[PDB]
Design a protein around this motif. Structure first.
Motif, PDB file in Angstrom:
ATOM      1  N   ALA A  52     -10.541  -2.486   2.647  1.00 34.29           N
ATOM      2  CA  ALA A  52      -9.499  -2.666   3.639  1.00 34.29           C
ATOM      3  C   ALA A  52      -8.443  -3.633   3.133  1.00 34.29           C
ATOM      4  O   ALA A  52      -8.732  -4.578   2.393  1.00 34.29           O
ATOM      5  CB  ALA A  52     -10.081  -3.184   4.951  1.00 34.29           C
ATOM      6  N   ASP A  96     -15.889   1.791   6.261  1.00 38.00           N
ATOM      7  CA  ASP A  96     -15.638   0.391   5.949  1.00 38.00           C
ATOM      8  C   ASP A  96     -16.534  -0.539   6.751  1.00 38.00           C
ATOM      9  O   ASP A  96     -16.808  -1.659   6.313  1.00 38.00           O
ATOM     10  CB  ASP A  96     -14.168   0.054   6.185  1.00 38.00           C
ATOM     11  N   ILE A  97     -17.010  -0.092   7.911  1.00 38.05           N
ATOM     12  CA  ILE A  97     -17.824  -0.946   8.762  1.00 38.05           C
ATOM     13  C   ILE A  97     -19.320  -0.742   8.530  1.00 38.05           C
ATOM     14  O   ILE A  97     -20.105  -1.669   8.774  1.00 38.05           O
ATOM     15  CB  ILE A  97     -17.423  -0.728  10.237  1.00 38.05           C
ATOM     16  N   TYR A 129     -10.670   2.047  13.772  1.00 37.34           N
ATOM     17  CA  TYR A 129     -10.009   2.364  12.515  1.00 37.34           C
ATOM     18  C   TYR A 129      -8.505   2.329  12.727  1.00 37.34           C
ATOM     19  O   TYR A 129      -8.008   2.724  13.782  1.00 37.34           O
ATOM     20  CB  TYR A 129     -10.426   3.742  12.026  1.00 37.34           C
ATOM     21  N   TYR A 149     -12.498  -6.116  11.314  1.00 40.66           N
ATOM     22  CA  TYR A 149     -13.791  -6.761  11.217  1.00 40.66           C
ATOM     23  C   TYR A 149     -13.632  -8.268  11.130  1.00 40.66           C
ATOM     24  O   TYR A 149     -12.667  -8.772  10.556  1.00 40.66           O
ATOM     25  CB  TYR A 149     -14.562  -6.268   9.979  1.00 40.66           C
ATOM     26  N   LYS A 188     -14.755   0.275  17.439  1.00 38.39           N
ATOM     27  CA  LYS A 188     -14.685   0.339  15.986  1.00 38.39           C
ATOM     28  C   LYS A 188     -13.356   0.961  15.584  1.00 38.39           C
ATOM     29  O   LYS A 188     -13.280   2.050  15.020  1.00 38.39           O
ATOM     30  CB  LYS A 188     -15.872   1.117  15.434  1.00 38.39           C
ATOM     31  N   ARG A 195      -5.290  -0.859   7.311  1.00 31.27           N
ATOM     32  CA  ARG A 195      -6.095   0.350   7.460  1.00 31.27           C
ATOM     33  C   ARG A 195      -7.563  -0.022   7.324  1.00 31.27           C
ATOM     34  O   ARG A 195      -7.936  -0.784   6.433  1.00 31.27           O
ATOM     35  CB  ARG A 195      -5.755   1.447   6.426  1.00 31.27           C
ATOM     36  N   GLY A 196      -8.382   0.526   8.219  1.00 33.18           N
ATOM     37  CA  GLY A 196      -9.815   0.320   8.198  1.00 33.18           C
ATOM     38  C   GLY A 196     -10.316  -0.066   9.571  1.00 33.18           C
ATOM     39  O   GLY A 196      -9.538  -0.091  10.521  1.00 33.18           O
ATOM     40  N   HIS A 197     -11.583  -0.457   9.669  1.00 29.56           N
ATOM     41  CA  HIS A 197     -12.169  -0.907  10.924  1.00 29.56           C
ATOM     42  C   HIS A 197     -12.017  -2.416  10.927  1.00 29.56           C
ATOM     43  O   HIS A 197     -12.581  -3.086  10.060  1.00 29.56           O
ATOM     44  CB  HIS A 197     -13.649  -0.537  11.040  1.00 29.56           C
ATOM     45  N   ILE A 256       0.856  -1.180   0.000  1.00 29.56           N
ATOM     46  CA  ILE A 256       0.000   0.000   0.000  1.00 29.56           C
ATOM     47  C   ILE A 256       0.896   1.236   0.000  1.00 29.56           C
ATOM     48  O   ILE A 256       1.977   1.238   0.600  1.00 29.56           O
ATOM     49  CB  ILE A 256      -1.004  -0.017   1.173  1.00 29.56           C
ATOM     50  N   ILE A 263     -17.425  -6.915  14.741  1.00 29.85           N
ATOM     51  CA  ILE A 263     -16.364  -5.929  14.615  1.00 29.85           C
ATOM     52  C   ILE A 263     -15.299  -6.264  15.642  1.00 29.85           C
ATOM     53  O   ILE A 263     -15.616  -6.509  16.810  1.00 29.85           O
ATOM     54  CB  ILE A 263     -16.905  -4.513  14.834  1.00 29.85           C
TER      55      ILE A 263
END
Lengths: 257, 48, 249, 34, 49, 20, 49
Positions: free
Chosen positions: C2, G39-40, C239, C112, C237, C108-110, A254, C119
């Motif tokens: 993600a 994203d969630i 991130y 899950y 959550k 990168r992201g939440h 990335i 989550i």
């Protein structure tokens, strides 16, 4: 899908050079600016390593100010260079000697031919010397060893710090090592800046300790050197690999800034 | 404007139909509502 | 959208995490040449940070400090901590009850569970988390990871680390609000900084972004496993955005 | 100071970081002595 | 008369009509007013009468 | 049609209660 | 010398509200929906002015 900049070649193309480019489909490219024109004179770190007066700090600053790009395809004399965008997952290539592990923070530095020379598709006084794509802390430590070579290199006249530079001389990382060039005027002015900081740190704040135009002159000649030495430290890591292709040809990454 | 006649010395105002300049107050109202990506996936991918 | 990455984790490091997903994992090319490349739990660096009091420190060292006191904390506790050697990459996906632990850590992201049903919270343990908080927070509190030493004896004396959660996004205001309560560390930091005439120390603290989280569903709590209970803080959550290693002093 | 009276520039143009950036990498006329 | 004449013609006619109609309002209320004022001038107060 | 609608609606369908 | 002490005090009060029939006129719009993407989950702000 993304921004895409084209290169036209002045050279009559060699089929072996086209074959090496088609090997280096996944490579990364040093570029001055994202104008959609690119000439061969513009493309490459040829534009950095052409003034043999100049040295590693300005090499790094040119690679900071100039656009980091990904090779995509080659179409005859034209070359397709997709400019990466922060957050997307891109296949890039390891042209530097340093191997890559998964998850690693990945960072641009200019390559050094001190013992580890690796030429390219060069024809007619232009090479396509790609930057070393090297880990983050390793990149910072390369620059730290370079600035201490340019500091300690004046005392070659003594056996002791001569042995200290020869003891430094060498950067060893995982499974891939390299030597390092000796500086005995970029690194010279860099250590002029460092030596002014070092001298004036015992000279300018002594009456500030007791409380906490001459002073403006001194702190000006301190702080502008401080700015010019700080600007060449923060390594701005280009990539961040998700998985490394085995035999270390390529890695899906990335892109960062 | 409704005015009214007189015979005394006071001049009743010559200005028939006084101009009024009114405007339209605006106020947007916004409601957020959420849908999980799980709920979107159980609409989309929709297994056996 | 993600980005996740399958990673080699040892089956003697897949625990905790494998009981209850959600941890930070740091990588490192350490000193022994045969197992040099190692990935690391946030609970596993908690037994290196001094801020975890020695009971809780040796509690999770009784969980899996067997591997810690095998070679690894002799490379982290024993061989002195650098912030260079450890690099944060995010929160685990893919629990992986397989033969060799292959944990697919997020970038990168939440974080899950797949299929968007669960989550993954970030389990930040208690003593590394709380004490650098700022104000009362609303929905987008940012997580920063800060290693902060204090100079005692061996040119550094003791390693220690923090997980500062703050709404303050900016670098220099964040290091100034660190400099507010870290006056003591910079006292003895100045002391051995002026002790080193020719020898050296290596500076105080190192800050980096880790992401943000829901932070009104933020709460503390506890996990429990082999070697007992472990009071932690659950960031819902979370991130993930691993920032740059920005040092201060 | 007499040259700076006759040199035009009342004081020295101080070192810009833009000028250091060309010290590390080297309408209007200009003159040639002969 | 591309109906610009029609709207200006109706505008002038409505200006005349609105002037005359406010005049009828003002005239009737002025009759009310001065009849009331005469009745007040010829009406002695209650304690007097 | 557009012109007669300028006379109808944009003068006012009722000449009373207002006059556009 | 002498002192004046001043102090405001806050009073929770149910306040009535009387108007006329169709006092002020409201014209509202057909609402627009923006899709904020996480994203969630996906958040939809409906917004009507």
């Amino acid at each position: 899908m993304e921004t895409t900049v084209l290169v036209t070649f002045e050279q009559r193309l060699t089929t072996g050079d086209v074959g090496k480019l088609s090997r280096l489909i996944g490579a990364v490219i040093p570029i001055p600016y994202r104008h959609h024109l690119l000439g061969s004179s513009q493309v490459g770190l040829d534009a950095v390593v052409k003034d043999k007066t100049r040295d590693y700090s300005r090499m790094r600053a040119r690679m900071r100010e100039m656009t980091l790009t990904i090779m995509r395809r080659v179409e005859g004399n034209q070359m397709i260079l997709g400019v990466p965008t922060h957050g997307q997952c891109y296949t890039i290539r390891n042209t530097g000697p340093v191997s890559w592990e998964k998850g690693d923070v990945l960072t641009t530095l200019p390559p050094v031919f001190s013992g580890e020379v690796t030429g390219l598709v060069s024809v007619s006084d232009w090479d396509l010397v790609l930057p070393w794509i090297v880990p983050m802390a390793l990149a910072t430590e390369i620059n730290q060893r370079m600035m201490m070579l340019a500091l300690l290199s004046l005392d070659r006249s003594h056996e002791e710090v001569r042995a200290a530079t020869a003891q430094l001389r060498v950067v060893r990382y995982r499974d891939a090592t390299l030597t390092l060039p000796e500086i005995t005027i970029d690194m010279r002015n860099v250590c002029i800046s460092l030596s002014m900081i070092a001298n004036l740190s015992s000279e300018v704040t002594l009456a500030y300790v007791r409380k906490l135009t001459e002073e403006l002159n001194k702190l000006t000649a301190l702080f502008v050197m401080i700015r010019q030495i700080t600007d060449v430290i923060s390594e701005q890591p280009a990539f961040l690999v998700c998985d490394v292709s085995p035999d270390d040809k390529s890695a899906l990454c990335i892109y960062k800034g | 404007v409704p005015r009214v006649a007189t015979g005394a010395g006071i001049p009743t105002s010559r200005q028939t139909t006084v101009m009024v300049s009114k405007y339209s107050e605006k106020s947007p109202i916004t409601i957020p509502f959420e849908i999980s990506a799980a709920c979107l996936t159980h609409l989309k991918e929709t297994f056996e | 959208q993600a980005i996740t990455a399958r990673f080699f984790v040892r089956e003697s490091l897949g625990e905790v995490e494998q009981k209850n997903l959600g941890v930070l994992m740091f990588r490192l090319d350490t000193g022994i040449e045969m197992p040099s490349t190692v990935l690391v739990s946030l609970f596993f660096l908690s037994m290196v940070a001094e801020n975890v009091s020695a009971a809780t420190k040796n509690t999770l060292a009784a969980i899996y400090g067997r591997e810690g006191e095998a070679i690894r904390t002799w490379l982290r506790d024993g061989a002195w901590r650098l912030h260079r050697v450890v690099h944060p990459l995010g929160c685990t996906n893919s629990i992986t009850p397989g033969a060799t632990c292959l944990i697919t850590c997020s970038m990168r992201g939440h974080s899950y569970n797949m299929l968007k049903t669960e989550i993954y919270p970030l389990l930040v343990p208690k003593e590394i988390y709380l004490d650098l908080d700022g104000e009362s927070t609303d929905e987008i509190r940012f997580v920063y990871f800060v290693i902060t030493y204090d100079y005692n004896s061996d040119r550094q004396g003791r390693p220690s680390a923090f997980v500062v959660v703050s709404r303050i996004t900016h670098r220099h205001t964040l290091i100034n609000v660190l400099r507010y309560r870290f006056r003591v560390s910079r006292f003895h930091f100045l002391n051995n900084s002026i002790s080193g005439y020719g020898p050296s120390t290596g500076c105080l603290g190192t800050l980096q972004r880790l992401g943000w989280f829901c932070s009104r569903d933020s709460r503390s709590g506890i996990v429990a496993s082999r070697a007992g209970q472990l009071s932690v803080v659950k960031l819902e959550k979370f991130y993930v955005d691993v920032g740059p290693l920005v040092e201060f002093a | 100071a007499w040259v700076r009276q006759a040199t035009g520039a009342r004081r020295t143009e101080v070192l810009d970081s833009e000028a250091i950036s060309i010290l590390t990498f080297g309408r209007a006329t200009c003159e040639v002595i002969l | 008369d591309t109906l610009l004449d029609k709207l200006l013609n109706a505008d002038a006619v409505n200006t005349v009509l609105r002037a005359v109609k406010n005049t009828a309002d003002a005239m009737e209320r002025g009759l009310i007013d001065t009849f009331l004022r005469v009745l007040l001038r010829h009406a002695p107060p209650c304690f007097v009468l | 049609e557009e012109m007669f609608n300028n006379f109808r609606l944009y003068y006012g369908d009722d000449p009373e209660r207002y006059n556009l | 010398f002498a002192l004046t002490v001043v102090r405001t005090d806050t009073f929770e009060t149910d306040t009535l509200l009387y108007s006329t029939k169709a006092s002020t006129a409201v014209i509202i719009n057909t609402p627009i929906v923006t899709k904020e993407d996480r994203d969630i989950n996906t958040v939809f702000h409906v917004s009507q002015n």
